[PDB]
Amino acid sequence: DIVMTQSPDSLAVSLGERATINCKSSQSVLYSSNSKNYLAWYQQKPGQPPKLLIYWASTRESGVPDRFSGSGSGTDFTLTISSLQAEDVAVYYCAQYYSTPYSFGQGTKLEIKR
Amino acid sequence: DIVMTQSPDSLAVSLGERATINCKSSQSVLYSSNSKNYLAWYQQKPGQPPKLLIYWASTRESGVPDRFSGSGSGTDFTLTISSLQAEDVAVYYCAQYYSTPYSFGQGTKLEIKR
Ligand SMILES: [Zn+2]
Ligand SMILES: [Zn+2]
Numbered sequence: 001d002i003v004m005t006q007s008p009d010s011l012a013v014s015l016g017e018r019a020t021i022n023c024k025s026s027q028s029v030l031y032s033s034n035s036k037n038y039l040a041w042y043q044q045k046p047g048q049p050p051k052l053l054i055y056w057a058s059t060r061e062s063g064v065p066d067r068f069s070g071s072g073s074g075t076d077f078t079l080t081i082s083s084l085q086a087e088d089v090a091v092y093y094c095a096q097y098y099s100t101p102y103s104f105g106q107g108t109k110l111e112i113k114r
Numbered sequence: 115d116i117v118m119t120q121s122p123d124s125l126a127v128s129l130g131e132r133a134t135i136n137c138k139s140s141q142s143v144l145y146s147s148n149s150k151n152y153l154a155w156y157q158q159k160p161g162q163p164p165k166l167l168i169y170w171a172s173t174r175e176s177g178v179p180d181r182f183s184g185s186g187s188g189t190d191f192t193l194t195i196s197s198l199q200a201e202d203v204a205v206y207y208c209a210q211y212y213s214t215p216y217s218f219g220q221g222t223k224l225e226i227k228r
Contacts, residue, residue: 040163049154049169049211097163100221106214
């Protein structure tokens, strides 16, 4: 399976600050036939299942705020939250749906200082 | 990682018929401390990313119709669609979020005869 490695494991920050998290895939998820990145980000709030946040590396899922921005390509991706809000506190996972079994990184937990 | 094995690989059916698909995990996803099954089902329509359908083995995600029913426990789960509708045609994946890396089965493609 393709291995997804994220960093940092956990990120502490205060409300309103910018947050950036990285993700690297053991092999490229950029398909040479259509130039699309089969890379998604899922948001997992405490005690909840992972919910789709972003896909195609940079496309936002219905209902996701503009403050969330996915970028990167090939094997290196990044999720950026320009100004972290209270409702954004959760563990974020990058995942590849390039080839089965689709796989997840081990996540980055975003907390608010304390 | 926990291995998720689904069956059948593909299921053909006509509009309105009942559809049942199975999923087995290589190890139990029933947590003995709270008796919850960290098992979810994701729906992947053609050309789209996997979207949350059911979690906690039987709880429906916001917006999911009553015709979808998740059941099972431990290592054996089942997704049942009482009367398949046109919009339900897609590949369904079971996934465990019991322990990282969260993993997906290789899916079951539901098609409408032809
Ligand atoms: Zn592997
Ligand atoms: Zn394994």
